[PDB]
Amino acid sequence: HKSEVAHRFKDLGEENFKALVLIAFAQYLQQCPFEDHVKLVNEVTEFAKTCVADESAENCDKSLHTLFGDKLCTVATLRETYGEMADCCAKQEPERNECFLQHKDDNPNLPRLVRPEVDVMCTAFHDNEETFLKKYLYEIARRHPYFYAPELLFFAKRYKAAFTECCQAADKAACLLPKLDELRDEGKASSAKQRLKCASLQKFGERAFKAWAVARLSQRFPKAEFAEVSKLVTDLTKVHTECCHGDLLECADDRADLAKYICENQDSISSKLKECCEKPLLEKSHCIAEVENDEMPADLPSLAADFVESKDVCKNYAEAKDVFLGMFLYEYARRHPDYSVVLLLRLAKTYETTLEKCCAAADPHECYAKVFDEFKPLVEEPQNLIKQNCELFEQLGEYKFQNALLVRYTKKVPQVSTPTLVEVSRNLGKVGSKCCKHPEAKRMPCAEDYLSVVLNQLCVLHEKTPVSDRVTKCCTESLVNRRPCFSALEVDETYVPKEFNAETFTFHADICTLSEKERQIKKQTALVELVKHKPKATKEQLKAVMDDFAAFVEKCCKADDKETCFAEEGKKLVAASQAAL
């Protein structure tokens, strides 16, 4: 291991090496032109090949951190452009590396990347495929500076495949656009989880995280023994703790080690882990992370034996409380992959509470029996919600389903901005389209996965612009009571109906030309303002207003004259609706 850079070059390969180096530099030097980074990439690459040919070369023995920090300090416009960051260069390793991480800017001031014309993209993709993909990879990296580089490279390859398919099909846009939308969503979904998980570790501590890890690991690796799960949880915590620090190399090494250990102890962990452990170093940790759940052993008892009817229960618990609780969580999780992680945590928390209570009583054996009865109400709560919402999603369309959620959440928290209500409603609706197509056995985990980011995304916007105390309470409570807290929200009887605005309910003929998406957007916007104006409106009354509006749109988008119809029949529609409500 004379040369870190040479070893990395051999493992990753030239292509991947180039991309990762581009991303790394782009995440630090977020305000340097693309051509600047291309020069850096080529300089580092050629030096790497130097080390590949001879690990005893002049600078090949240097550390990856040292080489990287050295290149950064060679940038001429470094002090002019980044100011304080240039002061890091005066420091010594390893102090210098820590300094560069501190002055890493998160979400700087850059214009939003506008998706160009399909014809323009495919033409550029054809003429200069490399400079086209790399230039965009540079644009994404500089904007999402804390996104794990290898993951960011994972999406880039998928983007390349999307253009390869569609850019030589007759109807390109019909192929490409739906794919680019899928990536954009997954890209921000993956980016949301990453910050959420890192925020959890800092906010609730390692214990709550370990409890979360024990649950999901036991679900994925039900055949694994508790001792094996403990080790995995322990190292998983060490990985995310380091990964959230920000150091790419250190983070990469920890993930690689874990993937290294898991593949070597494959028989001791999971059976459905063969393909992932066959893939290259760059795809190992990624493949394992989202591996399919292994199928649990056929002969599995109930927990009542070791956690209820058994003696020495308090003895074993008091001997090592978190361990014992972890064992309960392990045993319960491996049996219920159909459960959300948080649900298992609620159950474990419940089991914890009773042991603290009953183990102090005269005869603890009694208060044990109470426990498992307490689980049912907690379990069926998320189950009933899923059944009802999916049935609602089945009867009404997704769009109509979004509208239903729209009126519901508007009546619960009318203070929320209209654009925000419209966004979360459409998102929750999309969650319904995705998860409700799963059978019950896999619905709850699916819902947890999507709602977690939607709810945290929601609390983030509320963080910057607070509007409701009730919403703030849910956003600041335990991540196990977050979703339930939101579901506990009732209609706001405090809300004073906002004053009428004619412009808000004035429609023009332009909506007839609007895309099917933004026509819904403007209609859903008007719906939110309608509920905000008269919140005490019933479902029948509202449906009556919505029907008249729907017919009003068809009668003006079907006539010879259009703008006059929207202005005149628009006056009629508004006057008639005001009277009914």
Ligand X SMILES: CCCCCCCCCCCCCCCC(=O)O
Please, which of residues 112-141 interact with ligand X by CB under 6 A? 113, 115, 133, 136-137, 140
Which residues, other chains included, contact 135 with Cβ-Cβ below 8 Å and sequence gap of 6+? 34
- Considering only residues 23 to 62 of the shown chain, the ones binding ligand X according to CB under 6 A are 24, 44
- Considering only residues 73 to 112 of the shown chain, the ones binding ligand X according to CB under 6 A are none
Least distance from ligand X to the Cβ atom of residue 171, Å: 19
Least distance from ligand X to the Cβ atom of residue 266, Å: 16
Beta carbons of 27 and 107 less than 8 angstroms apart? no
**Which CA distances in Å does 252 have to 115, 171, 201, 552?**
31, 41, 19, 58
220: contact with ligand X by CB under 6 A: no
Pairwise CA distance, residues 407 & 257, whole Å = 50
Contact pick of 345, 406, 453, 537 for ligand X (by CB under 6 A): 345
Least distance from ligand X to the Cβ atom of residue 505, Å: 4
Task: Write each residue from 182 to 211 as x if it is in contact with ligand X (CB under 6 A), else as -, in one continuous string.
Answer: --x----------------------xx-xx
Residue span binding ligand X (CB under 6 A) among the ranges 102-110, 262-270, 295-303, 337-345: 337-345
21: contact with ligand X by CB under 6 A: yes
Could you tell me which residues are annotated as the binding site for Ca(2+)?
4, 11, 242, 247, 250, 253, 257
- Considering only residues 438 to 497 of the shown chain, the ones binding ligand X according to CB under 6 A are 444, 447-448, 451, 458, 461-462, 467, 471, 478, 480, 483-484, 486-487
Cβ nearer to ligand X, comparing 85 with 217? 217
Beta carbons of 30 and 79 less than 8 angstroms apart? no
| Of 434, 491, 426, residue with least CA distance to 454 | 426
Least distance from ligand X to the Cβ atom of residue 539, Å: 13
Cβ nearer to ligand X, comparing 219 with 389? 389
514: contact with ligand X by CB under 6 A: no
508: contact with ligand X by CB under 6 A: no
> Cα-Cα-Cα-Cα dihedral of 239, 244, 250, 256, to 10°?
40
Contact pick of 389, 427, 456, 457 for ligand X (by CB under 6 A): 389
Pairwise CA distance, residues 7 & 25, whole Å = 20
Q: Rounded to the nearest 5°, which phi and psi values hold at 416?
A: -60, 140
431: contact with ligand X by CB under 6 A: yes
DSSP 487-535: HT----SSPPPPPP-TGGG---GGGGTS-HHHHHHHHHHHHHHHHHHST
Contact pick of 337, 382, 414, 535 for ligand X (by CB under 6 A): 382
530: contact with ligand X by CB under 6 A: yes
Cβ nearer to ligand X, comparing 377 with 560? 377
Pairwise CA distance, residues 6 & 257, whole Å = 19
287: contact with ligand X by CB under 6 A: no
| Of 488, 463, 459, 464, residue with least CA distance to 475 | 459
Which residues, other chains included, contact 34 with Cβ-Cβ below 8 Å and sequence gap of 6+? 134, 135, 138, 139
